[PDB]
Amino acid sequence: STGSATTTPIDSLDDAYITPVQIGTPAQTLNLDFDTGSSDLWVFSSETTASEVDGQTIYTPSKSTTAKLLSGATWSISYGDGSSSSGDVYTDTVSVGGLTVTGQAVESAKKVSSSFTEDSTIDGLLGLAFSTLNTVSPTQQKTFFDNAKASLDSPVFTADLGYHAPGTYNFGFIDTTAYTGSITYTAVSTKQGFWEWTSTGYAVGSGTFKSTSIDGIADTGTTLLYLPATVVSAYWAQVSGAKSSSSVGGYVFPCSATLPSFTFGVGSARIVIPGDYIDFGPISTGSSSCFGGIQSSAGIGINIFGDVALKAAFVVFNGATTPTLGFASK
């Protein structure tokens, strides 16, 4: 089997991407944030504290003939941005782009933090990291991909995120029309539960490539590119007037700037992020200070190849017995 679904930016900045997901019988379609940095499929629901729902579409398990309470199971998750959610668990039928999994754990939120409430466009998350990170207790649950894997034509999924445009998540096949040149594969460590890999270096604009190992995670659920302070300083030093602002929470730059590109290495291959991808616009409405899309990972504890990086590539998440990651230009 295979599946193919379009993923759409939630706003004009590509802050996140939503993908329609069918849950239950008859189908309830919710727009979920596919997140290769976590491993829980959770949804706003009829159980979510009413004051914490503001415009989201909810899953109502009592209206699904295939929903079953997973008795005794609870979940609770906290994300890198400080947001969180928790609740109980149902199993139900879940379909993505025509690919169906029966008995998928659908984690129903009883509580969500303010950041989730305040974003009416995201109805929940669909985790695509390794199932070892799943938070369901006392019986850990598998991700949608893990459950689908054996049925897939090939044990892979691909992320093809757009810049200010829709893109695609495919399951079970590699669309050879969706990228240019060849795909370069690189080793993955699953030791921390992430799609963790080592970039071979970087360049800023038309500058020379610096060969240096940068361990980080491929994370579709993180908006920006978070890299070591040395690398980030080298990038922003090429933008007149750019500076790190503790008050704003990272590097800002004059909105009048033209940003240089940023290249990262994948083995001997190179992925070029155009400068425009690094512009996250005014820090507040009407400001002439703009927020940068490359930020320091210092104090996160891990480097994160988030959407800014991933959307410059066609990315293969190869879930074979020994997982790997593939990157192609597009």
From Swiss-Prot:
The active site consists of 35, 199
EC class of the enzyme, as a word? hydrolase
Reaction equation(s) it catalyzes: Hydrolysis of proteins with specificity similar to that of pepsin A, prefers hydrophobic residues at P1 and P1', but does not cleave 14-Ala-|-Leu-15 in the B chain of insulin or Z-Glu-Tyr. Clots milk
Q: What is its EC number?
A: 3.4.23.22
Using the chain's own numbering, where are the disulfide bonds?
255-290
Keywords from the UniProt entry: Aspartyl protease, Disulfide bond, Hydrolase, Protease, Signal, Zymogen
List, for all copies, the residue spans of the domain called Peptidase A1: 17-328
According to the lineage, what is the superkingdom? Answer: Eukaryota
Query: Which one GO biological process term can you cite for this protein?
Result: proteolysis
Specify whether Signal is a keyword of the entry.
yes
MF GO annotations: aspartic-type endopeptidase activity
Q: Which family does it belong to?
A: Belongs to the peptidase A1 family.
* Annotated protein name in UniProt: Endothiapepsin
Q: Whose protein is this, by species?
A: Cryphonectria parasitica
> What high-level taxonomic lineage is stated for the organism?
Eukaryota, Fungi, Dikarya, Ascomycota, Pezizomycotina
Which residues of the entire protein appear here: the answer is: 90 to 419 of 419
